[PDB]
Amino acid sequence: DIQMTQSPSTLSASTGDTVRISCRASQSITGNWVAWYQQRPGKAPRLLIYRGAALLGGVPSRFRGSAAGTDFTLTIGNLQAEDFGTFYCQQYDTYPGTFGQGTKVEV
Amino acid sequence: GFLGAAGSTMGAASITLTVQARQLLLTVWGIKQLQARVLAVERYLQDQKFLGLWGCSGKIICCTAVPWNSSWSNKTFEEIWNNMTWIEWEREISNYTSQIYDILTISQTQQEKNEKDLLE
Amino acid sequence: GFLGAAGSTMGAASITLTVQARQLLLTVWGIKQLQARVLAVERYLQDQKFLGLWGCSGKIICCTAVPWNSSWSNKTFEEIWNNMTWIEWEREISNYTSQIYDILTISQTQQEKNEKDLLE
Amino acid sequence: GFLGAAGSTMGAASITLTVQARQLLLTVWGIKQLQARVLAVERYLQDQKFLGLWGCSGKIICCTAVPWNSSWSNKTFEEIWNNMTWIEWEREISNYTSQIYDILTISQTQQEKNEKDLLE
Amino acid sequence: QIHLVQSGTEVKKPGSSVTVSCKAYGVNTFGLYAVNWVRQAPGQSLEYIGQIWRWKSSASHHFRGRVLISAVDLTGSSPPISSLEIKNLTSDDTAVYFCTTTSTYDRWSGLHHDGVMAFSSWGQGTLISV
Amino acid sequence: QIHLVQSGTEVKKPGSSVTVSCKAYGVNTFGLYAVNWVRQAPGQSLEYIGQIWRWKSSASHHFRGRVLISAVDLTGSSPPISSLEIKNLTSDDTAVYFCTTTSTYDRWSGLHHDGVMAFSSWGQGTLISV
Amino acid sequence: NNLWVTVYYGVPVWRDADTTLFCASDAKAYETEVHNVWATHACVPTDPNPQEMHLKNVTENFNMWKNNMVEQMHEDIISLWDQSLKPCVKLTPLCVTLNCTDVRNCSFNMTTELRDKQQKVYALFYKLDIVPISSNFSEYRLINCNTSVIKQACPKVSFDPIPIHYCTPAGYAILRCNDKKFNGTGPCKNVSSVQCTHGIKPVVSTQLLLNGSLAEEGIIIRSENLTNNAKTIIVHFNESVKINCTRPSNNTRTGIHIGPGQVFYKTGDIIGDIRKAYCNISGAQWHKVLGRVANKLKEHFNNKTIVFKPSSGGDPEITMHSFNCRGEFFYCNTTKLFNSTWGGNKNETRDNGTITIPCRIKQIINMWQGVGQAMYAPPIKGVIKCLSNITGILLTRDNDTENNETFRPGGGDMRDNWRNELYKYKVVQIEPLGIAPTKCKRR
Amino acid sequence: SLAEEGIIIRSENLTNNAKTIIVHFNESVKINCTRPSNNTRTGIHIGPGQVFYKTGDIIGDIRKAYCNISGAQWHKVLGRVANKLKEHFNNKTIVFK
Amino acid sequence: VTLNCTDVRNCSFNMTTELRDKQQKVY
Ligand SMILES: *[C@@H]1O[C@H](CO)[C@@H](O[C@@H]2O[C@H](CO)[C@@H](O[C@@H]3O[C@H](CO[C@H]4O[C@H](CO[C@H]5O[C@H](CO)[C@@H](O)[C@H](O)[C@@H]5O[C@H]5O[C@H](CO)[C@@H](O)[C@H](O)[C@@H]5O)[C@@H](O)[C@H](O[C@H]5O[C@H](CO)[C@@H](O)[C@H](O)[C@@H]5O[C@H]5O[C@H](CO)[C@@H](O)[C@H](O)[C@@H]5O)[C@@H]4O)[C@@H](O)[C@H](O[C@H]4O[C@H](CO)[C@@H](O)[C@H](O)[C@@H]4O[C@H]4O[C@H](CO)[C@@H](O)[C@H](O)[C@@H]4O[C@H]4O[C@H](CO)[C@@H](O)[C@H](O)[C@@H]4O)[C@@H]3O)[C@H](O)[C@H]2NC(C)=O)[C@H](O)[C@H]1NC(C)=O
Ligand SMILES: *[C@@H]1O[C@H](CO)[C@@H](O[C@@H]2O[C@H](CO)[C@@H](O[C@@H]3O[C@H](CO[C@H]4O[C@H](CO[C@H]5O[C@H](CO)[C@@H](O)[C@H](O)[C@@H]5O[C@H]5O[C@H](CO)[C@@H](O)[C@H](O)[C@@H]5O)[C@@H](O)[C@H](O[C@H]5O[C@H](CO)[C@@H](O)[C@H](O)[C@@H]5O[C@H]5O[C@H](CO)[C@@H](O)[C@H](O)[C@@H]5O)[C@@H]4O)[C@@H](O)[C@H](O[C@H]4O[C@H](CO)[C@@H](O)[C@H](O)[C@@H]4O[C@H]4O[C@H](CO)[C@@H](O)[C@H](O)[C@@H]4O[C@H]4O[C@H](CO)[C@@H](O)[C@H](O)[C@@H]4O)[C@@H]3O)[C@H](O)[C@H]2NC(C)=O)[C@H](O)[C@H]1NC(C)=O
Ligand SMILES: *[C@@H]1O[C@H](CO)[C@@H](O[C@@H]2O[C@H](CO)[C@@H](O[C@@H]3O[C@H](CO[C@H]4O[C@H](CO)[C@@H](O)[C@H](O)[C@@H]4O)[C@@H](O)[C@H](O[C@H]4O[C@H](CO)[C@@H](O)[C@H](O)[C@@H]4O[C@H]4O[C@H](CO)[C@@H](O)[C@H](O)[C@@H]4O)[C@@H]3O)[C@H](O)[C@H]2NC(C)=O)[C@H](O)[C@H]1NC(C)=O
Ligand SMILES: *[C@@H]1O[C@H](CO)[C@@H](O[C@@H]2O[C@H](CO)[C@@H](O[C@@H]3O[C@H](CO[C@H]4O[C@H](CO)[C@@H](O)[C@H](O)[C@@H]4O)[C@@H](O)[C@H](O[C@H]4O[C@H](CO)[C@@H](O)[C@H](O)[C@@H]4O[C@H]4O[C@H](CO)[C@@H](O)[C@H](O)[C@@H]4O)[C@@H]3O)[C@H](O)[C@H]2NC(C)=O)[C@H](O)[C@H]1NC(C)=O
Ligand SMILES: *[C@@H]1O[C@H](CO)[C@@H](O[C@@H]2O[C@H](CO)[C@@H](O[C@@H]3O[C@H](CO[C@H]4O[C@H](CO)[C@@H](O)[C@H](O)[C@@H]4O)[C@@H](O)[C@H](O[C@H]4O[C@H](CO)[C@@H](O)[C@H](O)[C@@H]4O)[C@@H]3O)[C@H](O)[C@H]2NC(C)=O)[C@H](O)[C@H]1NC(C)=O
Ligand SMILES: *[C@@H]1O[C@H](CO)[C@@H](O[C@@H]2O[C@H](CO)[C@@H](O)[C@H](O)[C@H]2NC(C)=O)[C@H](O)[C@H]1NC(C)=O
Ligand SMILES: *[C@@H]1O[C@H](CO)[C@@H](O[C@@H]2O[C@H](CO)[C@@H](O)[C@H](O)[C@H]2NC(C)=O)[C@H](O)[C@H]1NC(C)=O
Ligand SMILES: *[C@@H]1O[C@H](CO)[C@@H](O[C@@H]2O[C@H](CO)[C@@H](O)[C@H](O)[C@H]2NC(C)=O)[C@H](O)[C@H]1NC(C)=O
Ligand SMILES: *[C@@H]1O[C@H](CO)[C@@H](O)[C@H](O)[C@H]1NC(C)=O
Ligand SMILES: *[C@@H]1O[C@H](CO)[C@@H](O)[C@H](O)[C@H]1NC(C)=O
Ligand SMILES: *[C@@H]1O[C@H](CO)[C@@H](O)[C@H](O)[C@H]1NC(C)=O
Ligand SMILES: *[C@@H]1O[C@H](CO)[C@@H](O)[C@H](O)[C@H]1NC(C)=O
Ligand SMILES: *[C@@H]1O[C@H](CO)[C@@H](O)[C@H](O)[C@H]1NC(C)=O
Ligand SMILES: *[C@@H]1O[C@H](CO)[C@@H](O)[C@H](O)[C@H]1NC(C)=O
């Protein structure tokens, strides 16, 4: 029931460049129930950030998010080699969950 | 004693959140006793510091004149108190608690200074 | 410090129950010190819980709007405060204390809810 | 947390004496922990006894209706709050503290009895 | 630790039924854990089918009378397994299917909220085409 | 413990300069302690000249451009010393000079208050005459 | 039309936490004094009338294998045992050459009251305690002369386990599942909050559980990693089976003075007839319970033919059934109990006869594995008899692959004895502070 | 912990010679202490659980323990320390024995 | 005890072993 979109759809960056990944939801999520996903080409994604800006055990400290009402931004400081790939932000406060089209990083 | 009506609706909890309220009345076991008593005293003192510092002091249903920006929550009264329980609400506002406490303290000191200076 | 005027009439106790009031300012002996201090803290905290829970909080002569059914006592003011002392009265109402405390708590929460809802 | 603005003027201390206020949130080391916790509890309880006994209870800037005989001090407002700091003032009234506390307690009980008897 | 492995890839025909089994290695029980089924279309955003959370099957709005969720807990030899059953398949269902499992033991962890939840662990995926 | 010994007595002429050195035995530092110079006229009330409190020289209202205060802290052999220097001496300056030292470590002791302070220890005195 | 912050104190909100739980015993003392190992004293809080409070429509997740209450209890068990046996006879002058001949008549040079004198002492030592080190008299040594010194239990200390209650301090609570056929992991249907756990007796046993709490309607098999064969399997009992263990071997203990206040008690000649210890098992009831256990295991094991084999690895504490009757440790075998095949041909064998199992009593007790202090149990004067009603088994699954799963007895750590009884409880802390928006505008 | 800009000599009774003198370092000097004397420790049972570990024969070559001090840095630091002591000691010739 | 020695020294002494009766020579 939440139509969530993320911009820019495509972007390009090199190693060591801070990258802005943001997605404005259709409705405000006051509970910070947003999850960030990073899918490598071929295999499955993994969960990086949950509950707005909370890290997961076994994640590099370069993935930090923000929760400001409807705006949710993901930051990649000192972009690393494996970080290249599509990204997804998902809301899990209202049944059912919804993802975005996909933001990818290219050289 | 406060565990009663935990899963009930918020209205039933409120009418129950005051139904029990509180009835009150070298050895390793002695060490455990002392640790438990000191811990309970510390928790009670912490709660009383927060209550008295917000101006509540010894009142159960404590009022405050702090506004409710649609940033901590955006739902309306009836759904908060019917489509929810106390634990659900606490999880909803889990990481806004520090900001809310700070705003309560600032509002309390503001109103206290205002009344002291208007007392002339 | 409150032991003064213990055997006096209730009026003299009341005028004295505020005359002292309170002036304030591994070893087995250390263990005894710690036990005594923790026990004193617990008793003080218990008394303050009861006072604040009845709405008294930090007031010595605390008022309450609870009626006085002729079941806890049937004697009239002058004889209560002249034909009696504080210990005699406490023995008279010894096993009604729990019911009286419960009624005080219910009355306090009732009046607090009433004022909160009339505050509109 | 109260150490901030210690050397500042009294006005700056007053506007700061509420800026931090309080953010809150067999082994020899365990023995030290227990001693420290009990000592902190005792100091907090002492301060709260004095505050509630003067009628302040849970208020930071507590008012009182006690006069100010030119025996504890003979200087006038502006110099007290500009030509002085909090430590200087405490040293100035260091050995009048007991008398001042006693007078506060007497005034509190007097006003409480007066209001109870006027409540008719 | 937590390893999710599921069945292989195969090609079927329209109108048939597909059974995809997801084996959970390292998951103690499906009572504490919750398994969620999500589908990613080829070169397209993901889609959520349904879940069986503490033995309570559910499905998305579009998947009514269309998908079935099964789950089996710990056994003597096999690990806990959850199977995906879809019937009356059409040409639009050709996509990779993912099996996702997350822990719901802690209510304050933030991974779950009233049944809708994040996906901590993921499977390798099953390519499906006609 | 605390022993204050200073220079001897001598006779000088008007218009000359007098240097009276006070040696502090038992005083650790002049940072924690404070030395005060007071003069007692023959058969007359005392008078306060000035002080050097935690390395801050000062003097009375009448002693402006007239008296100089010096102080040296602990050394290898000599104890801390403070010297009294007065110039343009006149016939009214003939009096015994006292060296006084008190401890300022504790603020609640009451011996000191915003620089003006009591004199806990005293020296033997130096008779001065023309 | 706008909301204002309203502070609530006493909201029903709890969060997972671990704290120190104290002791709460049913008030004894009119049992004379009798300082038991689990000291009744210093368990000052006498349990009042239980204060129950059921939570309606509350579903709380439970995980028996990550509970901190078991570790609470285990550390308290070890600490209490050390505290109990510490302040009396040390018994260090015992590791010598034993010129011995079950049991053996052994002679050794023992230190008497004085430093100068030496006394020759003849004592009976069980073969389990004796260790070897063309003749007719051999020379021996004790079992644990290389691990730690041997220490006497203590003259007047009783080994009777009494129920112990575990309350929490103010601000904390315990959630009890109260769910029938609870597997120990997963959500609980309805939950009630209590202060102390039910009266639990700290019995110590291996490979076969002892006095405890029964089930509600069926047999519950609970194991952390049922798939893994290296994790012990715990079985709860629908119904209990009574067993009778006795030692009709009347002793005449005699105390000798081995130092200034060091009184050593040794086993003398057995007056009257000589008998060996045994335990009686009701054959019909035991076989019925084992059949029900196998039937309930079959569903968990894909309806395979469950077969029970006796213990294989030779290890005196592990292969035996450990327990104390009145101060004596028996260590019988359970081979005649755990030897059957269930479901292979669906038909019977069994019989219904009372089962008597031989026992090998010993006195040196290296219990709590190597963590606990070694103990010497003094002999008891009269005959020994205690009546026990079994509630639970500790099974172990065997690496090869076949159509039948072999479950041999023998548990793991001592925590498994109480894991069957602390599964339903879970300590939790409560935060009474709560903030909700209303229309108040005041204060 | 190092100092901030200079050498600090702190002593309770600098005049008294019976009180130790404590010197703080402007800058630190690294030292390397090693024992290239490979041991073969062996434990013996001297009681019920009493295991006593004794030094066995030194296998390989035999060496004696030593510590290495950077001569230039140590001498510079000592010279700075002496210079800062001279002012406290009336500019006397500081000698270390 | 008395150390029947010969830096370091090779010393021999009578040390108590596992048992109270036996005695071991330790270098
Ligand atoms: C401890 O303890 C505890 C307790 O006791 C436990 O728990 C447990 O657990 C267990 C496990 O182990 C479990 O069991 C399981 O369960 C699950 C679930 O179930 C559920 O669900 C289901 C589904 O639902 C759905 O559907 C339906 C129909 O269609 C509907 O109606 C509904 O509504 C739903 O729907 C929904 O959703 C969807 C999606 O999904 C959508 O789409 C829609 O729209 C909607 O929305 C169901 O069915 C169920 O039900 C049942 O049950 C109930 C109760 O619960 C009842 O009431 C009912 O009635 C039913 O019953 C019936 O049936 C039965 C059968 O048998 C019978 O008997 C009876 O009589 C009746 O009739 C529920 O609700 C499930 O799923 C599972 O199942 C499985 O298994 C079994 C055996 O066991 C079998 O039989 C089956 O079949 C299955 O199997 C399958 O799968 C597998 C996997 O892999 C495989 O292998 C096989 O082969 C199979 O497959 C096949 O078949 C299928 C069929 O379908 C197909 O599809 C395929 O393809 C193939 O062919 C089980 O059962 C339980 O539950 C629990 N409980 C509790 C209380 O919790 C625990 O676990 C323990 N622990 C330990 C450690 O031990
Ligand atoms: C640890 O650490 C710490 C820290 O580091 C330390 O502390 C330290 O200590 C030290 C000691 O050791 C010290 O030092 C010292 O100091 C002192 C003080 O000073 C101050 O004061 C002064 C005075 O003042 C006054 O005066 C002036 C002029 O006139 C004026 O201006 C002022 O204002 C004042 O006046 C006032 O008062 C009066 C009275 O008195 C009145 O009357 C009036 O009116 C008024 O009111 C001064 O001068 C000074 O100043 C200086 O300094 C400063 C800084 O501080 C500066 O800024 C300045 O500028 C100056 O400087 C200058 O000079 C110098 C010199 O050198 C040079 O260098 C430079 O460059 C410049 O130019 C101050 O303020 C003092 O006094 C002392 O002195 C001494 O010594 C020295 C050496 O060291 C020398 O040089 C000198 O001279 C002196 O000596 C003298 O004395 C002695 C005694 O005995 C003798 O012996 C000798 O011989 C001499 O005598 C001679 O000479 C004199 C001259 O005057 C004459 O008079 C006589 O007669 C003879 O002839 C010292 O310096 C320091 O300060 C401290 N610091 C701190 C930070 O604190 C501690 O100690 C340690 N501890 C341990 C244990 O180690
Ligand atoms: C309760 O007890 C049970 C049993 O004792 C235990 O189950 C065991 O769980 C572990 C989980 O770590 C399992 O180990 C994994 O098994 C999978 C599946 O292997 C299957 O296929 C192989 C080959 O055909 C068979 O030999 C095997 O028997 C299975 O049928 C493996 O895929 C896993 O591989 C990982 O480990 C490798 C080292 O062995 C590493 O190289 C690497 O980390 C592998 O993971 C990698 O795989 C991805 C590709 O798929 C790769 O892209 C990633 O980078 C990823 O890192 C692993 O071996 C073990 O088999 C289970 N045992 C049994 C008998 O089933 C439970 O875990 C236990 N519960 C708890 C809570 O402890
Ligand atoms: C599972 O639960 C069952 C519950 O029935 C339990 O069986 C019971 O065990 C207890 C503990 O051993 C038994 O109680 C003991 O009984 C003996 C025998 O007394 C008989 O004779 C008297 C008098 O004729 C009868 O009244 C009685 O019913 C018996 O027929 C007693 O001698 C024991 O006394 C000890 O406890 C006293 C307090 O009750 C203390 O004063 C003292 O500790 C006594 O021991 C002391 O005695 C020595 C002198 O002999 C003294 O020198 C020592 O210092 C020593 O401390 C005790 O009352 C009870 O009879 C059992 N019940 C049944 C039906 O058999 C199982 O044991 C339990 N499972 C496990 C594994 O423990
Ligand atoms: C809504 O409210 C929730 C309340 O929990 C907030 O969730 C917390 O968010 C914070 C900050 O994002 C999390 O803190 C971070 O946790 C990371 C995970 O660490 C795990 O693993 C280690 C090692 O095994 C454990 O010790 C630890 O307990 C965790 O299990 C850490 O890696 C992070 O460390 C980072 O900070 C340190 C300085 O502290 C730096 O050195 C590095 O940058 C390092 O990367 C960090 O501590 C916290 O875990 C979350 N809690 C939960 C329960 O999830 C939400 O953030 C909040 N919403 C918003 C929008 O703020
Ligand atoms: C909730 O669990 C409690 C267990 O504590 C159940 O209460 C028991 O109910 C039976 C019959 O309903 C009574 O005979 C018992 O005396 C009750 N026990 C207690 C401790 O009160 C209760 O039935 C359960 N509720 C539901 C809806 O299943
Ligand atoms: C437990 O007691 C039984 C009773 O005999 C022992 O069973 C016999 O053990 C011997 C040697 O261990 C074998 O030779 C016999 O064949 C066994 N008899 C049967 C019927 O199997 C058993 O060994 C004892 N266990 C231990 C550890 O001593
Ligand atoms: C031994 O087991 C038996 C059977 O489970 C228990 O006997 C019952 O005990 C309860 C209360 O303890 C009584 O209400 C029943 O009437 C008893 N039944 C019989 C047949 O006696 C006995 O309590 C258990 N012993 C111990 C020590 O727990
Ligand atoms: C609500 O919270 C946001 C988050 O910081 C804050 O910026 C805003 O000022 C708050 N609302 C009001 C009315 O101040
Ligand atoms: C007085 O006490 C009795 C005893 O329970 C009670 O029934 C009665 O209601 C009380 N009086 C009033 C006015 O309620
Ligand atoms: C001020 O203090 C003095 C000192 O005891 C006291 O006598 C006097 O009464 C006080 N002032 C008033 C107005 O009471
Ligand atoms: C022991 O040796 C043999 C073998 O048992 C036996 O006949 C003999 O009587 C015993 N005693 C002696 C002294 O040999
Ligand atoms: C084991 O259980 C399954 C499910 O109830 C049943 O179908 C199967 O027949 C059982 N096995 C045997 C041997 O009866
Ligand atoms: C020691 O210091 C004083 C003061 O700075 C100086 O006058 C004197 O020359 C110095 N001593 C030497 C030997 O340089």
Author numbering:
A (entry chain D): 1 to 30, 30A, 31 to 106
B (entry chain B), C (entry chain J), D (entry chain F): 521 to 545, 568 to 662
E (entry chain C), F (entry chain G): 1 to 35, 35A, 36 to 52, 54 to 77, 77A, 77B, 77C, 77D, ...
G (entry chain A): 32 to 132, 153 to 309, 312 to 321, 321A, 322 to 358, 360 to 396, 403 to 457, 460 to 504
H (entry chain E): 264 to 309, 312 to 321, 321A, 322 to 358, 360 to 362
I (entry chain E): 127 to 132, 153 to 173
Copied sentences from the primary study:
Structural studies involving temsavir and related analogs indicate that these compounds bind to Env within a conserved binding pocket that partially overlaps the CD4 binding site, i.e. utilizing the pocket where Phe43 of CD4 is normally inserted (referred to as the Phe43 cavity). By binding within the interface between the nascent bridging sheet and the gp120 inner domain, temsavir stabilizes the closed Env conformation and prevents CD4-induced conformational rearrangements of the inner domain layers that lead to the formation of the bridging sheet which is necessary for coreceptor binding.
To characterize the structural changes induced by the LMHS mutations, we determined the Cryo-EM structures of wild type CRF01_AE T/F100 SOSIP.664 and its LMHS mutant unbound and bound to temsavir. A comparison of the structures of the wild type and the LMHS variant of T/F100 SOSIP.644 indicates that the addition of the LMHS mutations causes no significant differences to the overall trimer conformation. In addition, without the double-side lock (Gln105), LM mutations within the α1 helix (Layer 2) and the α5 helix (Layer 3) form a different network of H-bonds (center zoom-in window). Interestingly, in the temsavir bound LMHS complex, the β20–β21 loop caps the temsavir in its pocket from the top and Trp427 directly lines the pocket with its side chain indole making contacts to the compound’s piperazine group to lock the compound in its bound conformation.
